[PDB]
Design a protein around this ligand. Structure first.
Ligand SMILES: NC(=O)c1ccc[n+]([C@@H]2O[C@H](COP(=O)([O-])OP(=O)(O)OC[C@H]3O[C@@H](n4cnc5c(N)ncnc54)[C@H](OP(=O)(O)O)[C@@H]3O)[C@@H](O)[C@H]2O)c1
Ligand SMILES: NC(=O)c1ccc[n+]([C@@H]2O[C@H](COP(=O)([O-])OP(=O)(O)OC[C@H]3O[C@@H](n4cnc5c(N)ncnc54)[C@H](OP(=O)(O)O)[C@@H]3O)[C@@H](O)[C@H]2O)c1
Lengths: 250, 250
């Protein structure tokens, strides 16, 4: 409890590491880019080469690369260099895609846990308490290891939500994707504070600031790999034109 | 300590009344609809017809009708029946229109103060403190009465902002109007809480519920009577379209 290897040590991978290190887990990391110095600072063992990574002593592998790159990343991995059957955890913001991919590409005897912490650096600055953690036990035999990993979030007092990947994607297309879409639209407008802001407008400016601090890759992945996203983008445009037209009538 | 009459005892009219009564001003009301029983519950005299209202003892008349109705309402007022020069105060959400209308329609010896408290029943439930109050001293000769009215909001800890009616409508088109438009758009979509709401999405549901509690009359008036509103609506529509365009080429 627990030796954890992180694939993709960018913004979100780092976020998770800080709390897992605090709880006492032993971390290993690997990534496309060089995080040697940062991992040195944090006492994480960093492997630049993913084949070297897969030979380390690891209970759990956490996939933390961008949605867009997950196919490339998993596809290149020498999964035949896996030393034991391992638990694979993804933390992608969309869920049907990693689920099908990992089911197709991973060795059969390896376990699959699909997850999405509904929070991050911009929204969980202090702690994780009363933030939501979604997960789906896609292929779990070793309940002990699975339970240990899931406990990482429970003991931070996350709200715990078990849900299918498809139901996560339907619900996320109608909520998170719309939320990001609005934040970006406001970012494209570059809204600015005024002397006479309303509470509502202050709220939108803060949403703009937060949504824009995510990568464009992340936002795109929400759309490209969520099959329910396109319809929500449509409903959003269709609703704005309904309001616009009632204004024209008036 | 003022004799204050409200014209238009609707939602916002009643909101202003509650605080002015508490401060110890003598308050009386008139309106298109009959608020006899509500005013009996609240302890103030209601005049059903404006003619009787105009011949009472009043230092300050506050106009709290809808933006759309202002011109009709002021036009139908037997303003010649006024006993004394009186302070007229506007609290409409747009400002160039009432400033122009009142300078045109009022007796010359009546004073004019144009205001927009940047808050209401839905956003200032407990107390006015730290909320913004904009005013423009359009035509003041009696600085004593006017300062005593303004002191109503200052006493409550409002952030006091003096600006021109034009600068107000420019900033308001960029902020308040935009905010209402997105709120109304989310309402047409009828977004709802999900088990995996992000903090950003909770923030939008709140905004939707809040914005949707305003009358469509009110929201119309923000657009129809603010000449800077149209370009802001284009900026929004144009921004959304660019965001969509970046997503579609992937
Ligand atoms: N609040 C959040 O940010 C949040 C919350 C929940 C879930 N997630 C999910 O966690 C994952 C990481 O999110 P993020 O915030 O760190 O930003 P991101 O832009 O979505 O992902 C950045 C990560 O992708 C890595 N990566 C590895 N191979 C890559 C390749 N060929 N192409 C592109 N990127 C590659 C990057 O590696 P290098 O750094 O080595 O270059 C980096 O580690 C995403 O799947 C995201 O959906 C994020
Ligand atoms: N948070 C807020 O709601 C807020 C904040 C700041 C400023 N304001 C401004 O305060 C004013 C009132 O706002 P509101 O929230 O009460 O809602 P509103 O829908 O903008 O206006 C309601 C008032 O307008 C009256 N009215 C509507 N049409 C009329 C007509 N043809 N003829 C005569 N009177 C008419 C109504 O009279 P009856 O009720 O008797 O029918 C009611 O008193 C507006 O100008 C608004 O821009 C509102």
């Amino acid at each position: 409890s627990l030796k954890i290897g992180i694939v993709g040590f960018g913004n979100f991978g780092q976020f998770l590491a800080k709390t897992m290190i605090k709880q006492g887990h032993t971390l290993t990391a690997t990534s496309r880019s060089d995080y040697s110095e940062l991992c040195l600072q944090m006492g994480i063992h960093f492997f630049r080469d993913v084949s070297a990574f897969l030979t380390a002593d690891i209970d759990v592998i956490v996939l933390c690369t961008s949605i867009l790159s997950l196919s490339e990343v998993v596809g290149s991995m020498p999964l035949t260099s896996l030393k034991r059957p391992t638990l694979f955890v993804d933390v992608l913001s969309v869920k049907e895609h990693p689920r099908e991919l990992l089911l197709r590409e991973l060795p059969e005897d390896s376990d699959i846990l699909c997850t999405h912490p509904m929070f991050g650096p911009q929204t969980a600055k202090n702690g994780w308490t009363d933030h939501t953690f979604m997960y789906d036990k896609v292929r779990i035999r070793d309940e002990v290891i699975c339970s240990n990993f899931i406990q990482i979030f429970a003991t931070e007092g996350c709200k715990m939500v078990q849900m299918s990947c498809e139901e996560h994607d339907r619900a996320a297309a109608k909520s998170q994707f719309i939320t990001h879409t609005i934040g970006r639209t406001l970012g494209e407008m570059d809204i600015q504070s005024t002397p006479i802001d309303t509470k509502g407008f202050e709220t939108l400016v803060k949403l703009k600031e937060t949504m824009m601090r995510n990568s464009f890759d992340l936002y795109s992945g929400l759309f490209v790999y969520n099959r329910f996203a396109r319809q929500e983008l449509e409903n959003l445009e269709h609703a704005l034109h309904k309001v616009k037209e009632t204004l024209m009538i008036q």
